Every structure is written in structure tokens, then in C-alpha cells.
Amino acid sequence: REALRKEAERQALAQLEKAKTKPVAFAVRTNVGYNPSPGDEVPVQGVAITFEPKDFLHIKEKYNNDWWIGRLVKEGCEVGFIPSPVKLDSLRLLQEQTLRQNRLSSSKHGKRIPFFKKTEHVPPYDVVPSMRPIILVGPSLKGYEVTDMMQKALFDFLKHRFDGRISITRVTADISLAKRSVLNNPSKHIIIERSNTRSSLAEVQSEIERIFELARTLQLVALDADTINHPAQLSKTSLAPIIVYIKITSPKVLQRLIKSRGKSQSKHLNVQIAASEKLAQCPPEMFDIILDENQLEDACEHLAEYLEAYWKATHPPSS
Amino acid sequence: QQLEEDLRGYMSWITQGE
User: Are the Cβ atoms of B14 and A256 closer than 8 angstroms?
Assistant: First the structure.
């Protein structure tokens, strides 16, 4: 009875050991939190992973129908058992039923689903690249010289600073189109309209596949994505980028920089100033790192430090 | 004084992006 179960718990603990050194099979970003409890029937008691909404998990293997093996992408965190989407759904359902059981008959009805309202189902996990692609936004719009040059200086810095550990590539499709819901069912989102779009969804899909593949061996991935000027353009995709905001805090400074480029750039001052203002209006949490340093070496050092910390989070020594 | 320093630093940054 309890010897069979001491045993099958030894098989699972052996598989968990072995998983420390497997490659990352795939990564997810969660849409739900999970607090394990003993009744969850974790294959090794006490070794489920706790996580919150929007955490990142690297998955080594699917252990069985109910459990995966992997780790939170965070320094010090080691592999453990992670509930599969199936298991999370079964636990969620039990949690709703147990809520009804514990309810007080003195309670009144809940606030109603308002009639006819359409909701997209959100799965507990979204598959994301195993290394979050680094995308630069700011100080103003891409395709103008102040922004393009300042961004180029930073990727040039990264190319040498993380040589042997990084891929830097230009994205050839408008990746803002890669909405999780559109990519997951393209025929459900056909909209007949007149628009200035330049990429097909097939092209966008090939690009997303290429990005995932660059990240599979856990090298840093940086993208020159020229259509992406604002983090909201990617927040509904399953790219989960690291958004790096190059921030010129003083718009008077930006105006003078644009003017330094000559009349052919400063005739577009207004559009560039407006874009810079929009980034400055953004809640700071839509950025992963804000570089507001006025020296290139200083902005570089800050970004490199962040990326070294991200390297540590993605490459544990037990790997 | 900060404007002047910002301009000098960011102008240098731009050149390095050439």
C-alpha cells in the first residue's frame, strides 16, 4: 500500500534528477497562478512549482498527462513538477465546486455575465520563445536617423559584448500582427478592410517561427523590428519580448538632436516628438528596462547588466 | 547645464551609430 507508493515516488524523483540536465523543450508564460497543496497528488510530495500569473516556465519534459517537469525562469529556482493544462483545469473545477460547497446560503447571486458579451478563452499557459527576444523602442520613431542610429549603436555594442551568446537579426514581417488569438485560429479572424498593412499573415507566421527557433538553444536573441515603436504593439502577441526603452527625458534635447540631422529630418520633427511623448506617457511597467542615461557607455553597461542577470535566470548551473 | 551635457552625450551616441 504505502511501499508501492514510496517506490513510484522514487521513480518520479529519479526522472526529476535526470531532467536537471535535459535541454529546455519549450517555454510558457502563465496566465494563471498556482499554489500547490498536498491534495494535488504531486508525483513527489512537496516538489511542485509555485507560480503567479505572467511568470515564465522552462519545461524539460511532459512527465504524464497531469504533470510536466520544469522550472521558474529565475535565479536559484530548480526543476520541479508543474501541473499540465489538464491538471490545472481539473483543480480549478474542484476549486469552484468546493467554493459552492463552502458557500453560505445567506449569500446572494453574483454580478451577471452581461447578455451577448463575447469572451476569448485564455488558456492557462501560452507557449513563448525559450529566450525572450530583445526589442528596442525609442527615443522616437524608427525609420528616422536619431532613433535608427541610437538603436544601431546599442545593437553594435551587444554584438561584441555578448559574442558567442547572442543572435541579432532583422525582422522581415510586421510582428505586431502576431496576436495570440489570430495565430491560434487564422480563419476565425478574416477582416475585409482597406489598410496600409505590408505583411501577410503567412509571412508573419514564418517570422514568428524563425524567432522561436533562434531562441531554442537558449542564446540571447535580439530583433531589429522596424514596425515596433511602442510596447502595446506586442503585448497581445506570444513573443513576450524584453522591451528596452531608450528614453530621452527632455524633449528639448530630442528637438535639438533631430535638428542636428538637418532639414530633411527636422521637417519631420512633429511626428517624432509625438512618438517620444507617447512613450513617456506609458506606464513604466510596460518596459523591461528604461535607459535614460545620456552617455552610450552608461546605457550599455546598464543593459548588459540586465542581460547578464537574464542569462543567469535562463542558465542555471545545474543545467 | 544639463541640456548642454545631454546634447554632448547623445550627439556622441548618435555618431557611434554611424
Answer: no
